[PDB]
Design a protein around this ligand. Structure first.
Ligand code: K
Ligand code: SR
Ligand code: SR
Lengths: 325, 321, 321, 325
């Protein structure tokens, strides 16, 4: 048994990667989009709250400092000056809130007594506008543009290698839950092996192909109802020599690919799966999915992941039939 | 009289009965929720949500104001949020503050630390739901949905003589000037078969070689062109009689795939011909509008054909025998 | 003979009657915003929004005069502290829609309908602002549809190479950006009559440049020539030099390509007309070596010279016969 | 030794194109290109200066209309359209209030100035217009991903190997991050300068390397770094090369691995080559994807290294072809 070396659909990559050079640095150099991917709904709101609240507290503190520096402290008696109608540090609170949130309560109005105040408040306003633009841009970017949803495609696990049209074939079918059929639906079949070269060397992992009809052009299936993609057996095929004990006591991963174009959005969907050692039940044909009605046709998934029996099949190897000249 | 898997265009029968796995959120409350609520009721839902936000905030301010300074009225009363004597005062205060309106008729005074705390929280709330609503209304101008406008198939298809053999033919019609990039084309035959071992297979799909290996499938489409399918030994329509053609045992589905300019939408088109639109003989009337500098076409006669005087009926391998 | 059907070389096509299925339902916003393209839409929308301002000003003025004709001043104040009905209401609407809190007038508790009405106008104003800002964002962010940076050549360069006849065409890229998944095609347009004796005004034939062999996906950083070897499968296998000059066959080339950092599939069309032909010509070695540096220069791109010696109509005859 | 790729992507290292200006002039006529060229180095200052110059222009025009008509013409009587301002700073601050929609109640306008209301409604309109322009400009960079990533990478060291009774030009490709690719092409192109049959010096030209385009083994499903075979044959143009021929001569093997990043719309691809000596005769590759006892973990520490094969034939392809018979 192996039960690894595949994408995380069944089992998985099993503790991905190992200690190496890494080179996955400068995360915050371009974290504009990665953070929006990672932050998630859990604490984005509090991130914005804390960032922008500290943003106006810094400026409120500097207004408080300049108010202490100039104006009232020079002469508290009479002294027509700035910080009118407000006092202390609550003055800084209210001024910062009114100016940042563009609220016009009008209790405090700066004047010619503080010529630096106009420059200070205009710089504050432009910085606040920039920060608001950043916030709204981030919220827009996370909400609408990405679409992480691809589960409407499903690969039936149970599969069969058996008789068909006078020859042998191993088959697999796909299903969908809703409408909006795919466009340019490819299909592939790859087999995981371990080999030793003729010169002599241990190759740990090897990829070999299964001819599902790439050169015949029968791969672009128009999928509205489940269909069983098959593979005829021949001497060119790498599986012409397999027995029951051979298939049962040896492990090979038939990884499958159904990369497809979902409707509308330009997200290239792609699904992966494999059958490890025993999911292929020899001599177990498939059942009809017919749900015919007098008026038109529909179907439900009340018979998936099962099989009908066949008692009369050549219980032998693929080349055994070729032996019978 | 069969299933007719062809989708909405032309004949239409596609659906599913039982429900699998659906949920984890309204439907997305992310983007499909905005998709389904197009035009109707989305403005109503969000505007009622926002006005209920004002109602909640103003109710809280009214409660805190009546708790704080309403008890000692008619005796000085230098409490916070002055100029309040009823619910309407605090309600309109919330209206101004959340709409960042600076009327100034309202007041906040000092020594009311809870008031400023709630003011900053409600300001943040107003800002964040303003961002949410602007992002939501943005999505209306995000996905352009179209299934027409320089892409359509033909209501008429026919099998007829042509140089070499009989051929199934079909054209694709257009509306405007715009062209198509990577124009695929495919034909599939749906029928029923029985395995030699013996078992009922009502559903079987076979391919029609329109020249996938020969490379004649990417058509530069500016005027309608009749894609044709030759007849050979590999084809399943090698020799069938008139009873076969007027019988209903096969269905021809035709599929086109393209990408309109200045967009990333993989447009797909599907059409059907069961047993009746295909006719024996006949020929398409040419679009013969070759004139001076005035270059024109007209699809007024697009869906029509005429009849050949005399044509062979069977032929096939008659020369060898 | 002159019914050209391309776009970038010369000529075009037009449509008449065509059933008129391309009728706008005004349900499309992106196309409407694209069509104007910064010409007059800013003016259209600013006048739309200021007429909304005037509508609101008029309705506030009407309600004010409704209350104004009742109290007639010299009473317990009013809902709005103003005397000039039109100007005060207009400025009130302006400042409220712009969130300006000048506060020269008041609100009072005598007009709850005024509170309801200002709530509705604030909602309408925020929705309209969101709509306009979203439209501007959608139009500006979506690119201008450049569709350039790839250029074709002038005339067919039918000549000899490696002892065989061949047509060649080069491609220029003035910028530095490269292409991904660059296809290449070549279609010949002509007129044909079938063996049965019927007229086909327009017929397309393919000119393979490497399909089914893999040599069509060029990695384009230096201007490279694409050539078509002459074989039996080629249509113009052997024919006189005078007739091809008299002939009006049209060669159209397609260089579908993907430009970096986008999702738009570019495509280019060219014009090679048979009325002018340069038989037996060869281009210039654009590649120049600069010791430590390498370069090419497009000053001689649209130029070719003549080989002093070249076989004429070197067919199977006189080479095997 | 002319070429187009030295060791790595963007390895042109030459002069920019000259004598062409047909469609490379109107750089500023576009907005997206201007946003792409500019970065956060100076954008803050650009927006700041634009919007503050709008401020100054509006303040100046309000001050000019105040001089034209108002209270300063006849200082007596309170009949004026501003209850304040008789100074540049006050008018500027009023312009700031109007632009940033603060809402200070310190000043207002009188009904006898229809110009004033016309001016301020145009003021609000243009304020909204430039606010929308700024927010869209700042949005453009945040949402659309423009940074280039290098999750996939080639191998520095490549070898020519005597494997499976034939000869190959072995090379493998590594993936840094865990993410996978969709529709993974692979190509190999030889750059050379030749002379035609009649005797003309052909400039730089490209020839193809048959990695299995027709056999269909090019769409590799990449979760473990896998080598690429070539299976040198008589049809290949590398047959006549000998042991010293590769060293004395030179040739550029450009490799492209066009791929699709997960859940996006970018057709990423990478370019690399080997000049004349990076290819080592014989040699093999260590099991970089070494099996770990529990499950699969892979270390790339030994990625760019090779193991010296004890004994392999050292001759040309024609030599082995003739030695066979
Ligand atoms: K092929
Ligand atoms: Sr605002
Ligand atoms: Sr694409």
């Amino acid at each position: 048994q192996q039960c690894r070396s595949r994408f995380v659909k069944k089992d998985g990559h099993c503790n991905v990667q190992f200690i190496n050079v890494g080179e996955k640095g400068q995360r915050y150099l371009a974290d504009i989009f990665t953070t929006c991917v990672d932050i998630r709904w859990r604490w984005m709101l509090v991130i914005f709250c804390l960032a922008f609240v500290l943003s106006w507290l810094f400026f409120g503190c500097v207004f408080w400092l300049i108010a202490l520096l100039h104006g009232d402290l020079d002469a508290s008696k009479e002294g027509k000056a700035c910080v009118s109608e407000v006092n202390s540090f609550t003055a800084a609170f209210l001024f910062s809130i009114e100016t940042q949130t563009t609220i016009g309560y009008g209790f405090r109005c700066v004047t010619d007594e503080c010529p630096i105040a106009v420059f200070m408040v205009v710089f504050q306003s432009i910085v606040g506008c920039i920060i608001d633009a950043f916030i709204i841009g981030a919220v827009m970017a996370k909400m609408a543009k990405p679409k992480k949803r691809n589960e409407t495609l499903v690969f039936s696990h149970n599969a069969v290698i058996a008789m068909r049209d006078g020859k042998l074939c191993l088959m697999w079918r796909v299903g969908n839950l809703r409408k909006s059929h795919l466009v340019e639906a490819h299909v592939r079949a790859q087999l995981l092996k371990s080999r030793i070269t003729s010169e002599g060397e241990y190759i740990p992992l090897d990829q070999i192909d299964i001819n599902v009809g790439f050169d015949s052009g029968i791969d672009r299936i128009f999928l509205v109802s489940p269909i069983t993609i098959v593979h005829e057996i021949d001497e060119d095929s790498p599986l012409y020599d397999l027995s029951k004990q051979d298939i049962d006591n040896a492990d090979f991963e038939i990884v499958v690919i159904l990369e497809g174009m979902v409707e509308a959005t330009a997200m290239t969907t792609q699904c992966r799966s494999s059958y490890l050692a025993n999911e292929i039940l020899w001599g177990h044909r498939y059942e009809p999915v017919l749900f015919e009605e007098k008026h038109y046709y529909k179907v439900d998934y009340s018979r998936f992941h099962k099989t009908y029996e066949v008692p009369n099949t050549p219980l032998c190897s693929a080349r055994d039939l070729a032996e019978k000249k």
